[PDB]
């Protein structure tokens, strides 16, 4: 496995916004507690899971464990950066896996919920 994505940025300034607070306390928390969250709570462990070619296929890995730590560490300056990371996580699943796969159905359920929660992101 590669190192996990960075979760801190020392050369960056930090802020908190209402949108960032919402992304952590509402969006991330709600997805985290979904019945299908567990495969998405940490980086894909291709060695342990014996996933052929995962990191040959997926060059931009992302997961909710990483997103959570980024939020907790005020890694994101712009809310969009966080939204993009969720989207990368879902897209990776669709790149690597096939229609009907259990992991795809799980991703789909999480994405649906994500969209519901981002729809209610405060202005
Ligand atoms: C994001 C992602 C995760 C995957 N698999 N994740 C797993 C996590 C845990 C297990 S397990 O073997 O540790 N636990 C299981 C496996 C099956 C049934 C119940 N528990 C298996 C796959 C997978 N493939 C493809 C993907 O694109």
Swiss-Prot record:
Organism whose genome encodes this protein: Homo sapiens (Human)
Comment, domains: The NET domain mediates interaction with a number of chromatin proteins involved in transcription regulation (NSD3, JMJD6, CHD4, GLTSCR1 and ATAD5). The C-terminal (CTD) region mediates interaction and recruitment of CDK9 and CCNT1 subunits of the P-TEFb complex. It is also required for maintenance of higher-order chromatin structure.
SUBUNIT field: Interacts with p53/TP53; the interaction is direct. Interacts (via CTD region) with CDK9 and CCNT1, acting as an associated component of P-TEFb complex. Interacts with RELA (when acetylated at 'Lys-310'). Interacts (via NET domain) with NSD3, CHD4, BICRA and ATAD5. The interaction with BICRA bridges BRD4 to the GBAF complex. Interacts (via NET domain) with JMJD6 (via JmjC and N-terminal domains); the interaction is stronger in presence of ssRNA and recruits JMJD6 on distal enhancers. Interacts with NSD3. Interacts with NIPBL.
Marked site positions, Acetylated histone binding: 97
Stretches assigned to the Bromo domain: 15-121
Note: JQ1, a thieno-triazolo-1,4-diazepine derivative, and I-BET, a benzodiazepine derivative, have been tested on tumors with success. Treatment with GSK1210151A (I-BET151, a I-BET derivative) has strong effets on mixed lineage leukemia and promotes myeloid differentiation and leukemia stem-cell depletion.
Subcellular location: Nucleus; Chromosome
Effect on the protein of changing residue 97 to A: Abolishes binding to acetylated histones
Cross-link entry Glycyl lysine isopeptide (Lys-Gly) (interchain with G-Cter in SUMO2), positions: 56
Primary role: Chromatin reader protein that recognizes and binds acetylated histones and plays a key role in transmission of epigenetic memory across cell divisions and transcription regulation. Remains associated with acetylated chromatin throughout the entire cell cycle and provides epigenetic memory for postmitotic G1 gene transcription by preserving acetylated chromatin status and maintaining high-order chromatin structure. During interphase, plays a key role in regulating the transcription of signal-inducible genes by associating with the P-TEFb complex and recruiting it to promoters.
Disease: Cornelia de Lange syndrome 6: A form of Cornelia de Lange syndrome, a clinically heterogeneous developmental disorder associated with malformations affecting multiple systems. It is characterized by facial dysmorphisms, abnormal hands and feet, growth delay, cognitive retardation, hirsutism, gastroesophageal dysfunction and cardiac, ophthalmologic and genitourinary anomalies. CDLS6 inheritance is autosomal dominant. A chromosomal aberration involving BRD4 is found in a rare, aggressive, and lethal carcinoma arising in midline organs of young people. Translocation t(15;19)(q14;p13) with NUTM1 which produces a BRD4-NUTM1 fusion protein.
This protein's name: Bromodomain-containing protein 4
Modification comment: Phosphorylation by CK2 disrupt the intramolecular binding between the bromo domain 2 and the NPS region and promotes binding between the NPS and the BID regions, leading to activate the protein and promote binding to acetylated histones. In absence of phosphorylation, BRD4 does not localize to p53/TP53 target gene promoters, phosphorylation promoting recruitment to p53/TP53 target promoters.
Expression sites by tissue: Ubiquitously expressed.
Family to which this protein belongs: Belongs to the BET family.
């Amino acid at each position: 496995n590669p190192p996990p994505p960075e979760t801190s940025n020392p050369n960056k300034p930090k802020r908190q916004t209402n949108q960032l607070q919402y992304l952590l306390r509402v969006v991330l928390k709600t997805l985290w507690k979904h019945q299908f969250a567990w495969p998405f709570q940490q980086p894909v462990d291709a060695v342990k899971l014996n996933l052929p070619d995962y990191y040959k296929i997926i060059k931009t890995p992302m997961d909710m464990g990483t997103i959570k730590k980024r939020l907790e560490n005020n890694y994101y300056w712009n809310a969009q950066e966080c939204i993009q990371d969720f989207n990368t996580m879902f897209t990776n699943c669709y790149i690597y896996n096939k229609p009907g796969d259990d992991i795809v159905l799980m991703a789909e359920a999480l994405e649906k919920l994500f969209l519901q929660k981002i729809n209610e992101l405060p202005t």
